[PDB]
Amino acid sequence: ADNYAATRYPIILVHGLTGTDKYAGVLEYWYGIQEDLQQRGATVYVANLSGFQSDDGPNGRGEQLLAYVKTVLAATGATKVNLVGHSQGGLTSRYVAAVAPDLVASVTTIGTPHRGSEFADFVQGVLAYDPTGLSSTVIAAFVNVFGILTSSSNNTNQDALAALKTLTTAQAATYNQNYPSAGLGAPGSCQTGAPTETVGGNTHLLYSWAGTAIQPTISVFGVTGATDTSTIPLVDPANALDPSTLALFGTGTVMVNRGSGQNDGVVSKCSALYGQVLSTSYKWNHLDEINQLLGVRGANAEDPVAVIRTHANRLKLAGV
Ligand SMILES: [Ca+2]
């Protein structure tokens, strides 16, 4: 079945925060996903945008993605593209679908903070505790450099503070006011919207899924513990071979303590709902979603590469 993932329109993978197409030009963001899709017949491109920036704005990643979609179409002769974004990438995809509706056939978001992340609120609140404010300046300086350093093309358009702000729950509400979508439920409802939207007379298939590895367990003294359901308790090799495993269980404990409920360490189930929700049950943390830390995942986590491949075929069967 070499035409299994052969969609009519090219697939464009869109990375999230800190991303690029290849870290330091060496490590692929979407680990092993592009080769797999291609060996099953797909025409796939991986966008390379600013790892730190807001999505809208003249200098934003949205404008960057639009320019890339256009060069992908001109290069291939295709008329539309299928947009598949992870994390903040899903927000960038929504920008293009709203701004150039004729050029998009579908939008799929994987663990996307459509309503922002409680963890971002947390980080912003912490930064805001310095009465001198130097903390922001120094930390930002350091993150922007890390951006320029790791970007495949050493993109200098990095703004750590703009990116942090845009992932907060307050900011994400304004974004949704600004770029509505029939795929979103009412703000505050923790419900999805419709499975499709018709903008400019152009129809888009909308899809989403989220990982909910981090589940709250018990609460005492107003303190709530959480468990990482992706792994076998204490003993899982992924706790050892992939340092993001324990790190996201920790950031995930902060969120559960900020009232976010199930999450993947950085995005709650409620914030991730969009269009046709295929599943919110995956036992994945935020990086398991893109087969991350060199394809390492807990014993209970589903194979993210198989999930993405199956979706490419679902797109094909839907006619896009
Ligand atoms: Ca992992």
With 0-12 / 13-18 / 19 or more C-beta atoms within 10 angstroms meaning exposed / middle / buried, residue 64 is buried
Give the DSSP letter of residue 179: S
Measured in Å, residue 87 CA sits from the centre of ligand 1 at 15
Going from N- to C-terminal start, the domains of the chain cover 1-320
Annotated binding site for substrate: 17, 88
Helices (H), 129-267: 134-150, 160-166, 169-178, 238-241, 244-256
Q: What is the spatial distance between Cα 313 and Cα 16, in angstroms, rounded to a whole number?
A: 24
For residue 293, how far is the Cα from the chain centroid? 16
Measured in Å, residue 239 CA sits from the centre of ligand 1 at 9
Measured in Å, residue 72 CA sits from the centre of ligand 1 at 31
Token pair in block for residue 42: 């797909």
Tokens 């030009």 belong to residue: 25
Q: What is the spatial distance between Cα 190 and Cα 256, in angstroms, rounded to a whole number?
A: 16
Tell me the resolution in Å. 2.1
Looking at residue 155, its amino acid is N
For residue 261, how far is the Cα from the chain centroid? 18
Note whether 199 and 97 are within 8 A (CB): yes
Annotated binding site: 17, 88, 242, 288, 292, 296
CATH topology of domain 1-320: Rossmann fold (3.40.50)
In the chain, which ranges are E strands?
A: 11-14, 22-23, 27-28, 44-46, 81-86, 104-110, 196-199, 202-211, 214-220, 223-228, 276-282
Q: What is the spatial distance between Cα 17 and Cα 49, in angstroms, rounded to a whole number?
A: 10
